[PDB]
Structures are given as structure tokens and as C-alpha cells.
Amino acid sequence: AEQLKIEAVSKTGTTVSVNVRNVGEVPVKIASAYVLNATTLTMICGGS
Amino acid sequence: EPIVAAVLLIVVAVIGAVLVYLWFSGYVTRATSQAEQLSAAEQLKIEAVSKTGTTVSVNVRNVGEVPVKIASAYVLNATTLTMICGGSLTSPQQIDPGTIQTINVPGTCNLIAGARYIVKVVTARGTEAAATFISP
Amino acid sequence: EPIVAAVLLIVVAVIGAVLVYLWFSGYVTRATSQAEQLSAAEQLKIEAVSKTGTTVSVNVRNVGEVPVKIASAYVLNATTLTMICGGSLTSPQQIDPGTIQTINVPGTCNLIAGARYIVKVVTARGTEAAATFISP
Amino acid sequence: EPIVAAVLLIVVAVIGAVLVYLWFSGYVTRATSQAEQLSAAEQLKIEAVSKTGTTVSVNVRNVGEVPVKIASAYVLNATTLTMICGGSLTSPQQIDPGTIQTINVPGTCNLIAGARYIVKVVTARGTEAAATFISP
Amino acid sequence: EPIVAAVLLIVVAVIGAVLVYLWFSGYVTRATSQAEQLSAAEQLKIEAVSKTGTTVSVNVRNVGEVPVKIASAYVLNATTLTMICGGSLTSPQQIDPGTIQTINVPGTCNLIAGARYIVKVVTARGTEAAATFISP
């Protein structure tokens, strides 16, 4: 099983920067990031 | 000779396992999605009410993030939970998030000034919001 | 021969468990963080009111630290919770934290000097603030 | 040839599953309904107490909707939770809902005027009701 | 022939269930008892404080019943939660239940007469107790 957590996020202009923490013990690869709208599960920006 | 039958039985069992896997994936997906999208909840609140003759007008805002539809309104008597007037609305009214709408209690019911009355509105999905007011 | 079917069943169960874990992580994340974000509270206060002819002007101060949008204003009658004038504003007004804004009650409603009135402002999110004044 | 054994094993599994289902239904029914009934609550309250010589008389009011049986009564010392007199009643007394009964503390115990005394009654099911009084 | 494989599979499943039982008992026991013991709560209160030159002496009395170790002491500024002096003590001091001991703020920090200061002491387990005084 795999565990991830994001500690904090920051916004600079129109760019979103996210810090990701691996509480697991195995190497982790990040594939994509999204910005989801509330209660509709529809992406605004993101991709591979 | 039994070896051939055993191999065929193994093949049959493998095919059955593949079928079970296919159905299991489909079912877990559909049931999980159903549970997840029933998980969401809706919020309503009525700010103020007004009386014009024998007609009651109610203002409802959807403070949630999803649209909600108003389907019925009642005027309940206090401490007995018995309706005096109400029923299904002629046409359901849709309330956009962050907006307001006016809802009128269906039918015509007399009221007594200075009496205790509960005005109640119910959503299409079933969320309940209400308040009380003193009849003029 | 049943051993092969058992191994396939174990593999199917493991894959199903992985899928359940994936959705469970996604759901706990989204719902838990939504609850955390909606846990926040919002503060408003109206400093003073002024009457010009038949128009009521109210100054609303954002004593909170989050942006606020004003949606409606009312003039409530005493102890009957029935509005005399009010409704949705033409365009919502945004109030920055630590700042002040002026809000006009929609429409035109006459008043009686020395009578009791409750002026009330409501946010887009539903936060309620009010006060009373003596009509000139 | 192994096919016959496989079919027999399938039949045996079917019969075992049927038996497991039968017991499962029976057990879930009995235990679930036992929990459902035991979830109910029991309410008692004592209206007033009176002392005649060395006998303590207590009136117990059944505010609940279920019959109640009184099995024991005590006279507890203040702040130490140590009994002075009490025990099982000679015969349990039944108190109908909406009615009242008189309960006498078992045995005879001397008392001191102006002292802190706790009179306590316990139901057959275990519900606790009590009060304090100043001995004359 | 599949019957033998089925019997061996049943035996393997039984052994696995026994192992699961063993670990489950052990783990539920250890985690349950850990939660039970960490459920306990700890109490501190400081009776009075005294100032000699630039050294602050605090008397700590355990109203609790368990042994306590004092590990740090601070002098916090008013309403800004910023320490002026403090740190880990050179050697933690054990204070017996029902007794009192003297704790000195580590290091040397100047004071201003008639100023608003908060003196604070923390346990080895993290329990917090403090009070305020007028600096002479």
C-alpha cells in the first residue's frame, strides 16, 4: 500500500505550487496534478 | 486420462475467475460512485417571511455549492406537528447557489394573529429547513 | 485443480482491495478537507445606519479576515419577523477584511418616525448581522 | 472422472452455504432485535419523602411509559457513598406508568436530625433515582 | 482426487485462521491497554511565586496522585506568547504526589517592576500549569 500527504500549498500569480510528503518507505513518482471545483468533481486546469 | 479433464477444469475455473473479476470491478465502481455522490449534503435556510392577505411568501437561499429544488411547503402547528395548509408545489422551483428565490405556500389557509406557526420548506432530495413567525 | 482457482480468487480479492483503498483515500481526502474548510466561521458587524428620505444606508464592516459578499438587506417589523421592504441586491457587493462598505436597502419603503425597525444584512454564505434604529 | 467429484463438491458447498444462511438469518435476527429492545430507556423520579418515627416512606413517580418494579432502597451517607440501612425489599413493588406508589426502606435504622441523608431507589432493570432530605 | 486438495486447503485455512487469532489477540490487547493507560489525566497547580534578584522561584504542588517530573519553565510576555527567558532544566525535578517542590527558571533574565508577565511550567508528559504575578 502507498501513502502520500501534501503539507502545504502556495499560489504565485496563476501558478500553484504544492509540497508533497512521502510518509511511506518506498520511492514515489508523481504523474499529474489537478485543481478540482467544489462539489462537482470537474477539473479547471491540470494534466499529465 | 484424468489429466486432460483436470486441465480443462482448470481452464474453466480460470474463465470463471475472469468473469467474476469483470463483474466485481463493474459493481464496485458503480456502488462506490453511488455511495460517493449520495454522500454530498445540501444546506438551506429561510431568512424572512411575509404575509399578503392569506398568502405566505418565503425567501430561500441555497448556501451550498449545488443547485437545489423546492418541492413543497407547509405551515405546521407547534407542539403537535400537524399541518394546517400545504402540499406539493405546482412546479418545482430551482435555486442556484449564492442566490435567492421566493416560495409561496400552496393553497390558501386562514391564520390567527398572534398564534404560533412553523413555516417549513422541503427540498427535492429531502433536506429540511424551517422557522417560526408571529402572524400579523 | 481447486488450488489454481483459489490462487486466481486471491489475486482478484487483492486487486479489489487495492481499488477499495484507492477510492477510500480519494473520498476521505475530499470529504474530510471539505469539512475542514467549511468548519471556518465568518464575522460581520454594522457600525451605524443613516436615513435619507425613504432610502436606508447601512455601513458594514468586515471584522473578519476572509472576504465577504453582501446579498440582501431588510427592514424587519418588531417581534413579528415580517419584512416591510427588502430583497436581493442588484449586484452583490464585496467587502474586504479590515475595510468598510455602504449598503442600500433595495427598493423604497416608507417609515414612521419614532417607530421600531430592525435592519438586517445577510452574506452570500448566510452569515447574519443586524441592529435597530429610531426612524427620524 | 474428477468431474463427478467436482460436481459433488459444488453440491456440498451449496448445502453448506444454505445452512450458514439459515443460521445467519436466525442469529442476526435474535441478537439485533435483542439490542433493539434493550436500547430502550427507563425513567424514574421521586416526588417527596416522609419519616414516621424510624421508618422512611418515599413516593416514586413513574414518568415513563413502561411498567417499573422497585427492588431495593437505601439511605446513603453524605460524600462517602456508604449505606446506613437498606437491602432488598421483601416483595418487589410494581409501579404502573403515570401512577405513583409508596416505598418503605427495608429494616429499621436510627437517624439524626439536621443531618445530610440520601434516599435512593433502584429498579429491577438497574435505573437509579434518588434525592436528599433533612431529617426532622 | 480434488477432495485431497480441498482437505489440505481447509487445513491450511484453519492454520492461517489460528495465526490471525494469535496476532489479533496480542495486538488488540497491547493497543487497547496502551489507549487505556494514556487515557489517564494529570493535574498541576502552582501555589505561589517569589522573585530574588533576577531569579524566579516557583512552588509546584501536585493535586494529582501520580508521580510528576518538571522539565521546563518560561516567562512569557503578555498576549504575544513570546518567551523572554527559559529553557530545559539542567536536571528534571520529580515532585511526589501530595507534596510540593521549588522550581527555578533556567538562566537569568531581567525584569521590570510593575510589568505584566506570565510564569509557566510544563510537565514531562506535556501538561501545562501557570499563573501570573506583579514583578517587584
Fold blueprint:
This is part of a larger assembly, with five copies of chain A.
Chain A: E1 5-12, E2 15-21, E3 33-36, E4 43-47
Antiparallel strand pairs in A: 1-2, 3-4
Concise synopsis of the structure shown:
The PDB classes it as structural protein. The structure is cut from a larger assembly and holds 5 copies of chain A. Chain A is an all-beta fold.
Give your account of this protein's structure.
The structure is cut from a larger assembly and holds five copies of chain A. Chain A starts with a strand and ends with a strand. Chain A has a two-stranded antiparallel ribbon. Chain A has a two-stranded antiparallel ribbon with strand order 3-4. The first copy, chain A, is built from no helices and four strands. In chain A, 0% of the residues lie in helices and 50% in strands. In chain A, strand 1 (5-12) and strand 2 (15-21) form a beta hairpin. The first copy, chain A, is an all-beta fold and 48 residues long. Chains B and C meet through helix 1, strand 1 and strand 7 of B and helix 1, strand 3 and strand 4 of C. Chain A: It comes from Pyrobaculum calidifontis (strain DSM 21063 / JCM 11548 / VA1). Chain A: This is Flagellar biosynthesis protein FlaG.
